Amino acid sequence: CSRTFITFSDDATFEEWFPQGRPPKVPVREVCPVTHRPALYRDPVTDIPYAT
Amino acid sequence: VTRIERIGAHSHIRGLGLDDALEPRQASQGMVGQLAARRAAGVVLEMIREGKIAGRAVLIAGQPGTGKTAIAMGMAQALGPDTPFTAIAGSEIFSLEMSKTEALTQAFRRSIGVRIKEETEIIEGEVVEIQIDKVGKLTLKTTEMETIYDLGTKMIESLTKDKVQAGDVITIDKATGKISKLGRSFTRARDYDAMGSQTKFVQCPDGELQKRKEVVHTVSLHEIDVINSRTQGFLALFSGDTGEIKSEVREQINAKVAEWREEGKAEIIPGVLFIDEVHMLDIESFSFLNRALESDMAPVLIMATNRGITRIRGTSYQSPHGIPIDLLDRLLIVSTTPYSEKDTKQILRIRCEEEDVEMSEDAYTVLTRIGLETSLRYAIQLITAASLVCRKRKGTEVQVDDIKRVYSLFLDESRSTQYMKEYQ
Numbered sequence: 470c471s472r473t474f475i476t477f478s479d480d481a482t483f484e485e486w487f488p489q490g491r492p493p494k495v496p497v498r499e500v501c502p503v504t505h506r507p508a509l510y511r512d513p514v515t516d517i518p519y520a521t
Numbered sequence: 522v523t524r525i526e527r528i529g530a531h532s533h534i535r536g537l538g539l540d541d542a543l544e545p546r547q548a549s550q551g552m553v554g555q556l557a558a559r560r561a562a563g564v565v566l567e568m569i570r571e572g573k574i575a576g577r578a579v580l581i582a583g584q585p586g587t588g589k590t591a592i593a594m595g596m597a598q599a600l601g602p603d604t605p606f607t608a609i610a611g612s613e614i615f616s617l618e619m620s621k622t623e624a625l626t627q628a629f630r631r632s633i634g635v636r637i638k639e640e641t642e643i644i645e646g647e648v649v650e651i652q653i654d655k656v657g658k659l660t661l662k663t664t665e666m667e668t669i670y671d672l673g674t675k676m677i678e679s680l681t682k683d684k685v686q687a688g689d690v691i692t693i694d695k696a697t698g699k700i701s702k703l704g705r706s707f708t709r710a711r712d713y714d715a716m717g718s719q720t721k722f723v724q725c726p727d728g729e730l731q732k733r734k735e736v737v738h739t740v741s742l743h744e745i746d747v748i749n750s751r752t753q754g755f756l757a758l759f760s761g762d763t764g765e766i767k768s769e770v771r772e773q774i775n776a777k778v779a780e781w782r783e784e785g786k787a788e789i790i791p792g793v794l795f796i797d798e799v800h801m802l803d804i805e806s807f808s809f810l811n812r813a814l815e816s817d818m819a820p821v822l823i824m825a826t827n828r829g830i831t832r833i834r835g836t837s838y839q840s841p842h843g844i845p846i847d848l849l850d851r852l853l854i855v856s857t858t859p860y861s862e863k864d865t866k867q868i869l870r871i872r873c874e875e876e877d878v879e880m881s882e883d884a885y886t887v888l889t890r891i892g893l894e895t896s897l898r899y900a901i902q903l904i905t906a907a908s909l910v911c912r913k914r915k916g917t918e919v920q921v922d923d924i925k926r927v928y929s930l931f932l933d934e935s936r937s938t939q940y941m942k943e944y945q
């Protein structure tokens with residue numbers, strides 16, 4: 470056989486770069502507080518999401 | 522006020538003067554006479570407008586002055602700008618950057634129209650603020666409403682390298698091709714002393730921030746040259762690239778046009794290629810037209826010629842109209858008869874109407890009698906010349922004695938040749 474290894478013989482931090490975490494993008498479709506459509510915009514002055 | 526297009530030779534022909542039954546009228550919208558020829562022209566016009574069959578070819582033949590070019594202009598004005606009508610002379614294919622064959626192919630493809638319809642989602646608004654840290658946020662405004670957007674790196678790189686700035690009326694599409702639309706009218710007084718040559722100040726949009734662009738536009742199939750080079754629309758403004766590869770012309774562009782047609786994003790509208798003075802073509806060009814007419818999506822050819830039995834260019838052979846028999850076999854021939862004492866007078870009357878000249882009926886009689894002896898096309902020129910000679914005489918109507926004032930100044934081919942007894 471001809472198999473391959475990569476050994477991080479240095480500080481394990483250099484392997485620690487890669488693993489753990491892997492979160493989702495938590496937000497989901499936001500609903501506006503007026504017409505209750507799913508939002509298309511976020512107002513710069515309130516940060517409220519809105520549609521129409 | 523005088524504009525670019527003013528009174529030319531065929532200016533009075535505002536259409537082909539036919540009934541709904543394709544029956545020609547004695548005198549109608551600009552055209553006079555040639556009942557047989559105009560009925561035939563109407564029939565081929567109808568098959569142009571149906572568009573169902575490909576590579577049809579018609580030869581308008583006859584003596585100089587019958588109305589072959591006049592009939593072609595009648596067909597071209599009867600047909601709307603929607604259908605491509607390409608007019609060339611047979612002399613225009615004798616190129617230096619192309620061969621005869623490639624230029625003739627390009628003309629053929631110029632006679633096929635393609636109506637693009639394109640349908641794109643757009644974000645448009647005045648930029649209120651941009652922030653960049655790489656990541657940032659963008660505040661867009663329309664007179665109705667305002668929003669934040671979050672920017673990724675490609676969007677950021679095309680904000681900065683575009684030097685978009687607060688106040689710019691910006692426009693962004695899905696699969697962004699961001700283009701700067703305008704400049705805010707508030708960040709103004711900049712032209713207290715100067716503006717950039719590209720800068721504009723018209724105001725920010727209204728309604729929703731997200732909209733849909735419909736765009737419809739007729740290109741000709743010759744848009745093949747839009748894909749013959751790296752940057753290629755330029756070659757539609759300078760004729761540029763010469764023999765673009767057939768391996769991309771006949772399969773890629775036709776295939777993608779068929780795909781557009783099937784999806785519904787395009788539609789071919791086949792038009793007309795009018796080669797005037799077609800006898801100027803070489804046997805190479807004629808024998809090319811042989812196969813070109815057989816092709817799946819040729820336009821309809823119209824040809825005009827005034828030649829008898831004459832030599833074909835590029836040969837020592839003689840044939841009808843000066844074009845080969847194997848190509849006449851592929852044509853329908855429309856002959857044109859000359860005008861009599863009745864129709865010559867009437868087209869002179871039409872030309873006086875077009876040039877806004879008023880003539881005595883005596884002057885009409887004289888001008889017709891002069892035209893029937895030397896040439897039809899000459900009596901048309903005496904109209905304007907007599908108008909001018911009468912304008913300096915403090916007159917208001919062209920008179921019989923004025924036609925003779927012109928008739929001795931500007932002498933016909935006949936009298937001009939007859940006075941070559943001097944042999945310098």
Ligand SMILES: Nc1ncnc2c1ncn2[C@@H]1O[C@H](COP(=O)(O)OP(=O)(O)O)[C@@H](O)[C@H]1O
Pocket residue numbers: 530531551552553554555584585586587588589590591592827868871897898901
């Ligand atoms: N049927 C017609 N109706 C109105 N004007 C015509 C007609 N035929 C010819 N004329 C006039 O006479 C001129 C000569 O006709 P034209 O078609 O140019 O000659 P050719 O038949 O050699 O092309 C035209 O330029 C036009 O002004």
